[PDB]
Amino acid sequence: EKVYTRHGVPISVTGIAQVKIQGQNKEMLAAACQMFLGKTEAEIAHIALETLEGHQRAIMAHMTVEEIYKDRQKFSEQVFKVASSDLVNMGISVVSYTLKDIHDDQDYLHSLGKARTAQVQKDARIGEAEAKRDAGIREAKAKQEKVSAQYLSE
Amino acid sequence: MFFTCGPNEAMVVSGFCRSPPVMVAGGRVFVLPCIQQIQRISLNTLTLNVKSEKVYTRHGVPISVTGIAQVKIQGQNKEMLAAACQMFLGKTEAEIAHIALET
Amino acid sequence: HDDQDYLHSLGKARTAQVQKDARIGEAEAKRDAGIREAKAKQEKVSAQYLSE
Amino acid sequence: MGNCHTVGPNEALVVSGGCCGSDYKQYVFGGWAWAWWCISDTQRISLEIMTLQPRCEDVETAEGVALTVTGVAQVKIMTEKELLAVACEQFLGKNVQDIKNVVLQTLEGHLRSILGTLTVEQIYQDRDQFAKLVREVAAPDVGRMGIEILSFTIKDVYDKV
Amino acid sequence: RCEDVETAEGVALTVTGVAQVKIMTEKELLAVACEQFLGKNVQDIKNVVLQTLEGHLRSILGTLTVEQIYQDRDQFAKLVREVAAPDVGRMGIEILSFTIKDVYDKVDYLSSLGKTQTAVVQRDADIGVAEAERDAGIREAECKKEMLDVKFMADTKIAD
Amino acid sequence: MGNCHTVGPNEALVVSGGCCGSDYKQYVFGGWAWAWWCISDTQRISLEIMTLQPRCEDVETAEGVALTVTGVAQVKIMTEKELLAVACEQFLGKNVQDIKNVVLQTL
Secondary structure (H helix, E strand, O other): OOEEOOOOOEEEEEEEEEEEOOOOOHHHHHHHHHHHOOOOHHHHHHHHHHHHHHHHHHHOOOOOHHHHHHOHHHHHHHHHHHHHHHHHHHOOEEEEEEEEEEEOOOOHHHHHHHHHHHHHHHHHHHHHHHHHHHHHHHHHHHHHHHHHHHHHHO | OEOOOOOOEEEEEEOOOOOOOOOEOOOOOEOOOOOOEEEEEEOOOEEEEEEEEEEEOOOOOEEEEEEEEEEOOOOOOHHHHHHHHHHHOOOOHHHHHHHHHHO | OOOOOHHHHHHHHHHHHHHHHHHHHHHHHHHHHHHHHHHHHHHHHHHHHHHO | OOOOOEOOOOEEEEEEOOOOOOOOEEEEEOOEOOOOOOOOOOEEEEOOOEEOOOEOOOEEOOOOOEEEEEEEEEEEEOOOOHHHHHHHHHOOOOOHHHHHHHHHHHHHHHHHHHHHHOOHHHHHHOOHHHHHHHHHHHHHHHOOOOEEEEEEEEEEEEOOO | OOOOEEOOOOOEEEEEEEEEEEEOOOOHHHHHHHHHOOOOOHHHHHHHHHHHHHHHHHHHHHHOOHHHHHHOOHHHHHHHHHHHHHHHOOOOEEEEEEEEEEEEOOOOHHHHHHHHHHOHHHHHHHHHHHHHHHHHHHHHHHHHHHHHHHHHHHHHHHHO | OOOOOEOOOOEEEEEEOOOOOOOOEEEEEOOEOOOOOOOOOOEEEEOOOEEOOOEOOOEEOOOOOEEOOEOOOEEOOOOOOHHHHHHHHHOOOOOHHHHHHHHHHHO
């Protein structure tokens, strides 16, 4: 919540992670058993949650928002690499990390969105102008012929 | 004892030393009471009211479009039926209709 | 802790030094937006009067 | 206590137990198995399709136009050989709501990410190719936890602008 | 969580951190660990380590500038390790991980820093919308002109 | 329990059962058949005509003129050889309302 990017703009960013204890590795499991015995699931989740939040909020200033929503694959891969290294050091391997939502309370991204909406609304209006001119030209012409014939009959 | 079935349901059961899949729909199977487990799939055709509301076309104009589909589980194909039995056992008709409806 | 406000001014110096940059960026953005906004306004009015 | 149990093709029976202390894990779907009083563990994995309703709110594409895109994806636990070792060592016996919630959040993130990857004109015209690319990008990661992606697409699209 | 702490340039920040600490399992260091602390309870470990790492974190935070804690704070944690391992390890406590949870300011440093580009995207958006409106207006005026010319020609024939 | 059942020409009797485990399905309309306690299944298919009232509301032709056209169609389950395999494996024993509703929407 309210984390600064490498431009300094604050954006509310939510992330989702799937973390598991890789019991296949004997060394990593033996390391993990030295502290994870006797700890409930809630605390186990909570401690790694704070650690991964630290890693994410630290890497926030590496990649800019323009990078995060556009170039997300490299961002996610680097986040996974660094977090997985420092957490395997602690003993938990992250299966997969993702970014849930990005929110801006400063209206930073709304204008960037609105630019393209204007750029398409100009086309929306140009089509209507085409249709209206094309309809009116021949409607007026047909009106002209019918009135001319009516007066000829009169 | 043998359990007869019609041609609108697939009788697939696990007994003793029957590791390969068994595709039975319209036959009988000798079933031990305390060894085998019985599960059923209904093959009857169900109609789907595929409804689309406020969907854009290739011009972008939104039109409300309703579709109707008749979907059935082709039990004649052994491979397809064996694939379907891996997830459709234990699912009610309503959910079976609903998932394919969304798809 | 300082109750004499000795260190607060030393802190505030750098805050001013960064706020000048904060204002310079806004001035850049406003001038760059206004120049071409006014120019586009000019072209549309010129074309409208040409049609009139 | 229970001995000589078998399961139907819909669910996979998982047993693991060291007869002489060596790691012997057997995972068989719709087959035959036996387990004694305390030789192994008798558990089953429901391989039924899990329903997905991915609904992303206030998500923006490359050009930045905000959309509220709802999707549908078909997910089922696979039946491979080495991947089912991961599947058995991975999740159970957490219940079906746990599968659906976990897959919902992870595919929510992945769907929003790929939606940002392409532009709104592409999701307008060619969204079958959008789903084909969703497969290409989601198979490498959603398959890691043993979950297959039978189908993928978007349910409805709504805009405020 | 350090309150009202200032960096080299003196900008006041209220920086909250998170650190991973565990008693080590070495050979000679566990002699110190056993002769050192127990049997004081877990609250005692957490309080003692909390105050000592509070002091150490505030000290190192003062050591570097706010621009560094802004841009490169992974290196900040790497230096926290380099400076805290020599002393936090003396009482047998290891440092598995270290970083800062959140940063808050009363003299709005970071919010001021975001001002530089929070308007650049607004600049581009305004330019784009202005250009789009210009194009729409010009071509719509052209359409209106053509339709009026034809309508007036038809009306002239009607008048005749 | 019931043995040696026969049905009239209006309805087709369908039986299926594996005497030695092999798939033997017999579908006979208005004929003779026998079934033991659990050798096969005794079911009948009503081959009567189903009434249809197709009524389309607000439907438009090629030129686009909107019409509300109501129709009538005559539908009956066929009595072919290979198609009745599909007929028997397809629908029953859903009742007559099910035939009429399904055929109503599709037509």
